[PDB]
Design an enzyme around this catalytic site. Structure first.
Site, PDB file in Angstrom:
ATOM      1  CE  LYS A   1      -3.453  -2.613   2.164  1.00 33.80           C
ATOM      2  NZ  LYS A   1      -4.130  -3.157   3.472  1.00 33.80           N
TER       3      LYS A   1
ATOM      4  CE1 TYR B   1      -9.500  -2.301  -1.189  1.00 31.90           C
ATOM      5  CE2 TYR B   1      -9.342  -0.229  -2.591  1.00 31.90           C
ATOM      6  CZ  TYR B   1      -8.816  -1.071  -1.558  1.00 31.90           C
ATOM      7  OH  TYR B   1      -7.674  -0.919  -0.939  1.00 31.90           O
TER       8      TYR B   1
ATOM      9  CG  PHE C   1     -15.247   0.532   5.507  1.00 31.13           C
ATOM     10  CD1 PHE C   1     -14.863  -0.402   4.467  1.00 31.13           C
ATOM     11  CD2 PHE C   1     -16.168  -0.184   6.262  1.00 31.13           C
ATOM     12  CE1 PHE C   1     -15.054  -2.064   4.330  1.00 31.13           C
ATOM     13  CE2 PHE C   1     -16.593  -1.583   6.238  1.00 31.13           C
ATOM     14  CZ  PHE C   1     -15.856  -2.398   5.469  1.00 31.13           C
TER      15      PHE C   1
ATOM     16  NE  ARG D   1      -6.167 -13.363   4.047  1.00 36.06           N
ATOM     17  CZ  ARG D   1      -6.330 -12.027   4.418  1.00 36.06           C
ATOM     18  NH1 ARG D   1      -5.202 -11.665   4.999  1.00 36.06           N
ATOM     19  NH2 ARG D   1      -7.053 -11.328   3.761  1.00 36.06           N
TER      20      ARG D   1
ATOM     21  CB  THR E   1      -7.054  -7.815   9.455  1.00 36.65           C
ATOM     22  OG1 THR E   1      -7.734  -7.512  10.640  1.00 36.65           O
ATOM     23  CG2 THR E   1      -7.171  -9.190   8.778  1.00 36.65           C
TER      24      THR E   1
ATOM     25  CG  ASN F   1      -3.523  -2.887   6.773  1.00 36.10           C
ATOM     26  OD1 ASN F   1      -3.276  -2.505   5.573  1.00 36.10           O
ATOM     27  ND2 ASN F   1      -4.580  -3.779   7.246  1.00 36.10           N
TER      28      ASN F   1
ATOM     29  CG  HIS G   1      -4.332  -6.670  -0.531  1.00 40.55           C
ATOM     30  ND1 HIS G   1      -5.660  -7.127  -0.111  1.00 40.55           N
ATOM     31  CD2 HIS G   1      -4.540  -7.281  -1.860  1.00 40.55           C
ATOM     32  CE1 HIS G   1      -6.288  -7.805  -0.729  1.00 40.55           C
ATOM     33  NE2 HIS G   1      -5.589  -8.043  -1.765  1.00 40.55           N
TER      34      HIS G   1
ATOM     35  CD  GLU H   1      -7.123  -9.700  -4.510  1.00 40.90           C
ATOM     36  OE1 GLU H   1      -6.095 -10.253  -4.154  1.00 40.90           O
ATOM     37  OE2 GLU H   1      -7.858  -8.908  -3.612  1.00 40.90           O
TER      38      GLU H   1
END
Lengths: 149, 149, 149, 149, 149, 149
Positions: free
Chosen positions: E9, E49, E57, E85, E91, E112, E115, E126
């Site tokens: 990110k 998204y 959100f 993961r 998360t 965070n 992703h 994705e």
């Protein structure tokens, strides 16, 4: 038993290089006898840069060293002053070799991450000014393995 | 934001782990608001471990914390207390997870390398005791990227 | 102050993980009492996995453990046996947590990088098999900082 | 292909530099052909520093390499001897550049952490003396990416 | 073999965590099959998204991944989705264990750093969205030591 | 500001040094304005090595640049061209100094792991060829601490 003054400048602190700096001196085998996070006043900065009061850039050096907190330290060991200068790297970040602090982290000569005393008497002036209360004295148990006798 | 008290213990300094400890907290995104190498005096120790002064091992803690220098610290950030405890790992080095400071460097319960405020309440108490003059204030330039809004 | 047996499997050597592995035990505070690069032979391998002579895949274990040189080690320290398994991580690399050796490098059960004594019993036994000449003794100058009393 | 002898002095082991030292040679692309933890015999020592039988400091070098266990090694590769000493750094820590083993860890010439063959000829002699039974041979799978053809 | 989509990110790029991330997947033994630094458009963001468009959100997600460049990637290997993961961690940073990426560098749930696809199915979507031109194929020379047969 | 073209060659990717490399430029303070994994086509390759047309090994270099994917990048900052080269190290790995990329990982001249623009001139050329779409622009929030003004 020689001692030198090492200071992490405002940018070194902002760029999260504090732990990294200390690691180098610790791995080398030197002894930390002084350490503190501090913000400098105008009067102190000027006194620290006293030997430049009459220079075009003086006012700048003061503004900057005060534009944020710094980490002051005392390092003790054989040739810690010269060795310390070697670990830090060339004054001009463009000349510093990879493997040195400024070599791996600094680009601009004005944001050169750290400072180290240039001489023994120089370290003495610097240490007395930054550490009026004196050094924290202790003995390392790894000492007989870093020095002979 | 919230603040916590982290102290590198005498064995942490002797084993040259000072830099490394700082590195982890710096990497997490916390900002250092206090830092000092200290030689603890008997009476100061007794105040620090004052909440345990009734234990049969009280004097023991006093004897140890005073056996060598320690590095006092103030770290700020959201959940800094809980995370601090999490970064440090379990009390018993036998149950502390690899990845934690204790899991990576500690073996003996009596040589746990570092200390962290166990609660927000004990934090304010601890930083007040160890840092009478309060914290050194500054604003990380990467704040907008570590915290939302 | 028990000892345990850690062996870097053929793949660990091929992948250049010898130093890394050794570093984690060194930083944890353990003492190396045995170290050697060796390429195991058929019969010795059958005696190592001897406890699985009655398994279908037994033939393969021996085959593999001999496909390349391994690094045998003797590490000493409190809970070194159990701590060692913690440092290594889960048998199935799919479950081994990050921060542990297998968590960081291993992916397939067949290529799990390392082996460690699963018990004090297995330990005192494997150590005797691989290091018939006994361990190399010495004491860490920082011993009083890693352990108490 | 060329081979060199690298030995981690007693002070290198004490200071927990074993893994560190090995990591550097592994990352360079060199092949480890020999590795073991040895507590050196006095008579073995005198033969190792044979060509220094005449020097006054002869008994000193001998008493020292005997004082603690050491790590002997055989590394293979192109210019592994010259690169080996380059990787190690100036004989006198006062000159060793940061980035080299001695540069990052050594201070006293008497506790310079490690030894490396000064030439190909002396390496032959060194490996033959420290590794009487020859090296453990294997082929790196990345070889075709470290060397051309 | 199984593939997954990992994306660093904007905060991760800003905090200089690009290489650290890649290192963790490289050292795990996974194979990089796609790597691009991108400044995502509003429309593309809303697409990525999509499955969350009616969520409260949604605008935050969009405003966020569009605020700065990101690093999009494709990683291949057995259990790469679930493992990726596990490498990224909980998360909620406050819960991420030391050793994981978020555990080491994240604090605010909304910042965070990374992703990672949460399923083999979502991963294909994705990957097909971020790398419509397909992966860059190649075999690793250490493959035989990472996997069995 | 000034920008240069860095490329992690096939061997560099095969040996898993992508993260490592990006880390050095990131830590230095430079801004990544272009990054990608590419399997270069013969024609493209032939252009990249234009100036070496008249040469003989020409065809050899091309065959190699296409033998495996590479990682193309654009890094920006003051003196990034020559610094990038100082970070990379001498062309001949026998001369490359520890601390530099080739000094730490290269051995064979033909597997020098990386490439960097030799001048601002060639840099402008290389950047145009590999990144026709232009760079990805952004401002590090650390900028004011990496540069004075």
């Amino acid at each position: 038993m020689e001692q030198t003054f090492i200071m992490i400048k405002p940018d070194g602190v902002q760029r999260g290089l504090i732990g990294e700096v200390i690691c180098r001196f610790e791995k080398k085998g030197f002894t930390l006898k002084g350490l503190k996070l501090i913000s400098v006043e105008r009067s102190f900065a000027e006194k620290h840069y006293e030997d430049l009061s009459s220079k075009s850039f003086f006012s700048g050096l003061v503004d900057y060293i005060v534009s944020g907190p710094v980490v002051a330290m005392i390092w003790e060991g054989k040739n810690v002053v010269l060795t310390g200068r070697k670990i830090i790297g060339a004054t001009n970040p463009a000349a510093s070799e990879p493997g040195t602090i400024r070599g791996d982290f600094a680009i601009d000569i004005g944001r050169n991450v750290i400072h180290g005393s240039d001489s023994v008497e120089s370290a003495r002036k610097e240490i007395a000014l930054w550490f009026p209360d004196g050094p924290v004295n202790w003995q390392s148990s790894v000492h007989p393995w870093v020095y002979e006798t």
